[PDB]
């Protein structure tokens, strides 16, 4: 719904295992995968709350089932059936539909997060990097592990690299 998952980011990463969303960096010191702890933690909190909040709204059944009627109480029996089966139907609906809708929403939720994360990095780099479009940015200045960790941590120092990036751009 937001265009991140299966959109401008085609597929997922098998090598990233520590989180749902993350970064893939490649500098002169090497390549590597990292997982965004903050975004994945927020997603975990949200999904746990969703699942549990849904579950506790249906209190567990505490009674029993089973009634017996003789031949002269058929109008009774049908009524009983008409209740029991009826209730089951409602609950079946209330379960199935629920999951369906919830499932869609959950996926959209994840999509949003990825999009949001992407946007954050944009707001950090501005014209210091070039949007390739596959999901990343090519830096206009040399970046080591320190500045990459700053980008992941959200503490990017735009003014420090502004002069060098301007020349190369």
């Amino acid at each position, epitope marked *: 719904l937001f265009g991140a998952i299966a959109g401008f980011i085609e597929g997922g990463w098998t090598g990233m295992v520590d989180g749902w969303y993350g970064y893939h960096h490649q500098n002169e010191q090497g390549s590597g995968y990292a997982a965004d702890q903050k975004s994945t*933690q927020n997603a*975990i*909190n949200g999904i*746990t*709350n969703k*699942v*549990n909040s849904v*579950i*506790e709204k249906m209190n567990t059944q505490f009674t029993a089932v089973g009634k017996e009627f003789n031949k002269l109480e058929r109008r009774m029996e049908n009524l009983n059936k008409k209740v029991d089966d009826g209730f089951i139907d409602i609950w079946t609906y209330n379960a199935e539909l629920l999951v369906l809708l919830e499932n869609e929403r959950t996926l959209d939720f994840h999509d949003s997060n990825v999009k949001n994360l992407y946007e954050k990095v944009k707001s950090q780099l501005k014209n210091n990097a070039k949007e390739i479009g596959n999901g990343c940015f090519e830096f206009y200045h040399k970046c080591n592990d320190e500045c990459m960790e700053s980008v992941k941590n959200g503490t990017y120092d735009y003014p420090k690299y502004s002069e060098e990036s301007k020349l190369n751009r």
Partner: antibody
Amino acid sequence: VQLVESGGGLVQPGGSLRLSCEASGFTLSSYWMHWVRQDPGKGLVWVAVINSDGSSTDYADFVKGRFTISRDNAKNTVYLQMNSLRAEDTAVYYCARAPQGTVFGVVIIGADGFDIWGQGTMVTVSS
Amino acid sequence: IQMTHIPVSLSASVGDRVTITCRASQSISSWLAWYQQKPGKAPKLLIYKASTLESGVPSRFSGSGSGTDFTLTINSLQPDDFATYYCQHYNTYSRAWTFGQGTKVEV
């Protein structure tokens, strides 16, 4: 289901000790294993944690590489080896089990906390 | 992360409500567990996820809270409900396990 602890005893300062937990009733390979120490009278302090595969372990802020935690799922045991013990580290040590999580290590539905604990081994450091 | 217990110790009579509050230095969502320990024994888990009851725990225990302020209510205190109660922040992601000081309930 139960965990039994062994190895607790009196060790001089600067000494070493090796506590062991044996779990009877379940499989150790499907549970994170925690070591939690309680000073006599004081509260509960979490010491160490080992994962289901022994690859990821974590230790507390008051242990400066002194403790090493290991696991053996075939023998159904989890070991904690302390070295360079100081006088402060005298307590009853407990072995706790925690379920694994559906998402990564975080459980979404079902049991989450330290469901089953041990009985406690008294480790005393003195001269 | 720090867990603080209010009140540190409390006393109540059998058949009376009681509230034990755990406060967090930051927001720990619903990642709280309530344990009960009797003297010279091992703690038994009462509540996880700040609201769920462990199987076998009597329904008289009720947990409630989210974020930074949480509470354990023991409705209808019984003789077997006099112990020290601990709040724990557990987070398998981010690897954070922290225990409270504990509150002793007496009579």
